[PDB]
Each structure stands twice: as structure tokens, then as C-alpha cells.
Amino acid sequence: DAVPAYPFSLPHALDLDPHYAELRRDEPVSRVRLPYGEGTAWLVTRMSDARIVLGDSRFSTAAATDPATPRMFPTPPYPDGVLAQDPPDHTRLRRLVGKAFTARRVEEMRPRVRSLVDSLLDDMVAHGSPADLVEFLAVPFPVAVICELLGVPLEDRDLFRTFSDAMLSSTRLTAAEIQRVQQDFMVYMDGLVAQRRDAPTEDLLGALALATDNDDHLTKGEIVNMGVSLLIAGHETSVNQITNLVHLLLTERKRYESLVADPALVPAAVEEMLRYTPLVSAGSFVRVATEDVELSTVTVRAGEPCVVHFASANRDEEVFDHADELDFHRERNPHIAFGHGAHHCIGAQLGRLELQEALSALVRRFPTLDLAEPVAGLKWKQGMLIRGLERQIVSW
Numbered sequence: 001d002a003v004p005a006y007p008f009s010l011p012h013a014l015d016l017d018p019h020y021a022e023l024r025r026d027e028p029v030s031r032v033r034l035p036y037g038e039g040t041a042w043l044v045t046r047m048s049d050a051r052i053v054l055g056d057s058r059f060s061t062a063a064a065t066d067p068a069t070p071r072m073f074p075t076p077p078y079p080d081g082v083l084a085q086d087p088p089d090h091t092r093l094r095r096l097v098g099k100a101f102t103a104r105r106v107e108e109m110r111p112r113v114r115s116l117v118d119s120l121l122d123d124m125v126a127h128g129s130p131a132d133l134v135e136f137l138a139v140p141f142p143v144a145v146i147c148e149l150l151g152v153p154l155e156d157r158d159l160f161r162t163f164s165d166a167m168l169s170s171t172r173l174t175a176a177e178i179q180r181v182q183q184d185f186m187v188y189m190d191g192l193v194a195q196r197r198d199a200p201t202e203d204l205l206g207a208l209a210l211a212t213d214n215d216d217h218l219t220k221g222e223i224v225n226m227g228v229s230l231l232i233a234g235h236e237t238s239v240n241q242i243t244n245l246v247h248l249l250l251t252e253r254k255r256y257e258s259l260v261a262d263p264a265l266v267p268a269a270v271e272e273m274l275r276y277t278p279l280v281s282a283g284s285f286v287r288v289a290t291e292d293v294e295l296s297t298v299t300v301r302a303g304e305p306c307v308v309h310f311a312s313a314n315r316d317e318e319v320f321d322h323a324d325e326l327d328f329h330r331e332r333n334p335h336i337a338f339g340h341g342a343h344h345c346i347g348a349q350l351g352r353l354e355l356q357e358a359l360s361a362l363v364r365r366f367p368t369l370d371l372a373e374p375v376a377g378l379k380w381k382q383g384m385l386i387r388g389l390e391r392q393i394v395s396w
């Protein structure tokens, strides 16, 4: 049609396309053509609409498994995936692993997690300035945590990192490359679960194995694919967000300075930068209206698909004052960096904990921390549904 292509542009660093501000003011629900599937979808750019699309049972993610449905990513959605489940099947699927992810149990991890951080910043003072924060902190820290929590051997890091990168592909890989990797990841994760048949374990793969035999409502696909989801998300998010928050802090170095000063403002600064950063480069897993639903400016009809831009909802000038600006002293922060509704991030407390502990340590032990490579040459990941840096050389 004359419906525009979404994404609107190749992304630049952590910058928002300014069409998002235009769309927010004048056309906050707009028709867009997603890179894969057939047809058109409504793009949702404002906080109130995002909350309805993410929040209401009249929007179904399961309805989007149809290969004809528009989507951000080459492969048609895996039907046994958590994102493709609607409540109440979705609620039952999430109860299998949720206990592990409540703010209470995630708090219980802060000791082990801080020790791990210290050990790795130790190995980085040993190598000496300048060093690559990616090599020494951003990758090994979240990989260690999700490995211990799930029960995944650390010796498999290169294996699951390669699979995980492939499956967050936007334009870098083809549908058939990604379905291939998906099959391998399923068989590998099925393999690890099966090892707990006559040898149960006190870890989440432990729980996923007991479910295969003790639970009659959940298919083995769903249970095993859950293992894949936690292992992908459990390193892919935090690894990129550490590089992203650091990039935000050391470019306008006033922010890092201001945290060196008051290191107890780090929990608030993490929430503010979570609001400010497009971790999800563009759009979202799609929701299809199953009934007419009224958004701000339009009634989406049954069968019409919708896609949200999280980073755009988190720049809504009707919700956050001075949104175009990072403020660590904000009174309220009702951001949706972790989504909303049924599919609200399960790992949100873990990712909060890992971002909190990484930035605390750095601000406290490295007050001299600065970018020891040019901003113009920064190797931002290309052709993936998420943003982050491949390398971040820092001096102290």
C-alpha cells in the first residue's frame, strides 16, 4: 500500500526515531508494514494504548502463531512458546517456574550475585586498564547466574550463546537458518532435561523434568521451550543492558559522576535508564484483537493485529515530565521496560538485581571509569531484535 515499513529506519546507538514523537502527538495508533508475515498492523506509540494492548484478554498472542500474521522476525512464532500462550494456559505454564522469580527469592540471590561480580572485576583489575567491559563483566556475569539458576553447564556458554544470538535475529539471519537453530536448541534443552529422569536436581531444569512426568495439562514442547526461553532471556537481556546503561553513564559522564557521589541512587538510576533505553530495537511480539477494542483514537477490529514500541510508551510526555531527559531524581516511574499484563517479564526482579549489583560495584570501585574507545567506532549489534555493544573498552 502507501502504509510505511516498520521498523522506520536502521537503528542508531540507543537513539529513538523522531517519527515516534510525531506519531505520539498527532497519530498515536498508525498502520505499518512489518518486515515479515502478510498484511498491515497498528503500531502503538503511547502508554495508555500499550497498557490496553498488553493488558486486555480481547488481545491474543496465540492468534499471532499464524504465519500470515505480521511479525518483526523471520520465523513464524513457535506455537509452544510462552509468548504465544493466552491465559489461562499461559498462567499454568508460568506457575511451573514463577516461584524461582518472585522478588523475595530473587533478593535471596544478592549475596552469591555480588560475590560473582567482585570475582570478575578482580580478574579485570589483574589484566589492567584499558580492558573490554563486555569480555570481563557484561557477558560472564549474567551467563554464570542463569547457568547456576537453570542448571546449565558453564562449559556450554559458546554453544547456547550462538543459538541465542541466532534466535534474536531481525535481519541478520534467514527464516531457515533460525528454524534450524530453534530445532537444535529444542533438542539440546530436551537432552539436558532428560538427564534428570533418574537423577533429579535442585534447579529449574529440575522442576521442568518433574513436570514432564507429574503434570497432565502441559505438553513436553511447552515445558522444554520454557527452558530455552529462560536460557535466552536470562543472559541476552542483562548482557546488553549492562553495556547500554554503562554507555548512557560514560557519554554524558555527569550521570556516572552523580552515582559515584550517591551510590544509593543506583536502584533509581537503573529504573530511569530501563525507561530510557530501547533494549527491544523496534516493535514487539504481536497481539491480534479477538473482539473490537477501543484505543485512544481508533477501534481496532477483531482479527486486526497490533504491535507496541516499549521505548515509545516510556517517552509519553503525558506520563513522564521532561521525558526526552534522563532524571535519576524522578518522583514516579510507571515505565513498561518489562512489559505489562499476562506477559510482564518473569525475570524482571533478576534483571533489576543484576543491573543493580553491576553498576554499584563499578561506581564504588572504579570512580575513574571512562570510555577508552571513540563513540563513532562503537560496535553496536546489527540485525537483531535487541540493541547492545559487542565491545566496550574502558579505562580507569
Ligand code: HEM
Binding pocket: 082, 083, 084, 094, 146, 229, 230, 233, 234, 235, 237, 238, 241, 279, 280, 284, 285, 310, 336, 337, 338, 339, 340, 342, 343, 344, 345, 346, 347, 348, 350, 351, 352
Ligand atoms: C533488563 C532486563 C530485561 C528487560 C528489559 C526485559 C524486557 C522484557 C519485556 C519488555 C518483556 C515483554 C515481552 C512482551 O510482552 O511482548 C519481557 C518478557 C520476558 N522476559 Fe524479560 N527482560 C529482562 C530480563 C529478563 C531476564 C533476566 C529473564 C529470565 C531470566 C527474562 C525472561 C523473560 C521472559 C521469559 C519473558 C516472556 C514472558 C512471557 O511471555 O510471559 N527477562 N522481558
Ligand SMILES: CC[C@H]1OC(=O)[C@H](C)[C@@H](O)[C@H](C)[C@@H](O)[C@@H](C)C[C@@H](C)C(=O)[C@H](C)[C@@H](O)[C@H]1C
Binding pocket: 072, 073, 083, 167, 168, 228, 229, 232, 233, 237, 280, 283, 284, 285, 385, 386
Ligand atoms: C519482536 C521482539 C521480541 O522478540 C521475540 O518475540 C523473539 C522472537 C522471542 O522468540 C525471543 C527470542 C524469546 O526468547 C523471548 C522469551 C525473549 C524475551 C527477552 C522477550 O520476551 C523479548 C522482550 C521479546 O519479546 C522481543 C525481543
